[PDB]
């Protein structure tokens, strides 16, 4: 039985309100829950869904060189495959294999409805409306290392802005936009930005185009016998229109706005 590590992030993987009554993979529902079943069918294997221990994605500590999150659980042999919204990145692909992307995304701007901002440039040309990112991770580094005039101007601003414009978690950034009366814009992944746009009280919105291009991939350890079939199944699913169907289902059909 294939051990599948995943993370509790809406609407990818959630607990059914009556999870105690059920057991097995029946306790969960969501985009990745459905995706897992499909990948399992097209690769001919049995699996058990497990929630990543530390509830993280996967980063390598700079001093200890230890991997945490789902990537960690793969390189340390505790899981056979990772099916979740795990961004495909260089540092992670050095230690594990990524399938072709099953969903596209990018850094985007979230604003409280009515906020007079329509693009990253709009943000860079003022200070009345503060804006920031997660105090650590991909999106922060993007601005810190960008050579682009507008992004570099945004970085210089965020660097020294007071009060600090960085948040410890994604939920904190979203709440900050909702409770700042339009004086705070949050920079986060487009997929999460658009999900939140479809949730009550429907006071947020995604504006402007993506600042970059990324993708979520399914991960397997190096040398995994699953690697090949997983890759083909993701392509077949997308070619048959199922991935787009799956996203519309969890983002829109189940939307509240």
Ligand X SMILES: O=C1N=c2cc([N+](=O)[O-])c([N+](=O)[O-])cc2=NC1=O
Interface contacts to ligand X, rule CB under 6 A: 9, 57, 85-87, 137-138, 170, 188-189, 191-192
Euclidean distance between CA atoms 77 and 89, whole angstroms: 20
Supply the minimum distance, in Å, between the C-beta of residue 213 and ligand X: 15
Q: Which is nearer to ligand X, 153 or 198 (CB)?
A: 198
Q: Which is nearer to ligand X, 153 or 215 (CB)?
A: 215
Looking at the Cβ atoms of 2 and 86, the one nearer to ligand X is 86
By beta-carbon proximity to ligand X, the closer residue of 7 and 117 is 7
Strands (E), 47-132: 47-51, 81-82, 96-98, 103-105, 107-112, 130-132
Query: Is 87 flagged in the annotation as binding?
Result: yes
For residue 123, give the nearest of 100, 143, 98, 147 by alpha carbon: 143
Q: Specify whether the backbone of 138 is left (phi greater than 0), alpha (psi in -120 to 50) or beta.
A: alpha
Cα distance between residue 173 and residue 196, in whole Å: 12
Q: Binding residue per annotation — 124?
A: no
| Euclidean distance between CA atoms 161 and 132, whole angstroms | 9
Minimum Å gap between C-beta 21 and ligand X is: 28
In angstroms, what is the minimal distance from the CB of 232 to ligand X?
23
Which one, 138 or 224, has the nearer CB to ligand X? Answer: 138
CB of 46 to ligand X, least distance (A): 26
| CA angle in degrees (0–180, nearest 5) for 119-84-82 | 140
How far apart are alpha carbons 205 and 176 in whole angstroms? 14
> According to the annotation, is 162 in a ligand binding site?
no
| Contacts with 241 (C-beta within 8 Å, 6 or more apart), sequence order | none
Report in angstroms how near the CB of residue 216 gets to ligand X at its nearest.
Answer: 7
Residues forming the annotated binding site for L-glutamate? 85, 87, 92, 138-139, 189
């Amino acid at each position: 039985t294939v051990v599948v590590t995943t993370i509790l992030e809406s609407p990818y993987v959630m607990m059914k309100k009556n999870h105690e009554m059920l057991e097995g993979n029946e306790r969960y529902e969501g985009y990745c829950v459905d995706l897992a079943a499909e990948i399992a069918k097209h690769c001919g294997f049995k699996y058990k869904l497990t929630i990543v221990g530390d509830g993280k994605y996967g980063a390598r500590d700079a001093d200890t060189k230890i991997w945490n999150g789902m990537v960690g659980e793969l390189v340390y042999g505790k899981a056979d495959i990772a099916i979740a919204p795990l961004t495909i990145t260089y540092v992670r692909e050095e230690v594990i294999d990524f399938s072709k992307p099953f969903m596209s995304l990018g850094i985007s701007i979230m604003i409280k409805k009515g906020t007079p901002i329509e693009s990253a440039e709009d943000l860079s040309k003022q200070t009345e409306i503060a804006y920031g990112t997660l105090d650590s991770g991909s999106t922060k580094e993007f601005f810190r290392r960008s050579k682009i005039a507008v992004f570099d101007k945004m970085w210089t601003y965020m660097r020294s802005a007071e009060p600090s414009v960085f948040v410890r978690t994604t939920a904190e950034g979203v709440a900050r936009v909702r409770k700042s009366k339009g004086k705070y814009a949050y920079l986060l992944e487009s997929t999460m930005n658009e999900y939140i746009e479809q949730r009550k009280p429907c006071d947020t919105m995604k504006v402007g185009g993506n600042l970059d291009s990324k993708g979520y991939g399914i991960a397997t350890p190096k040398g995994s016998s699953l690697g090949n079939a997983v890759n083909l199944a993701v392509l077949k699913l997308n070619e048959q229109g199922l991935l787009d169907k799956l996203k519309n289902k969890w983002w829109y059909d189940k939307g509240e706005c």
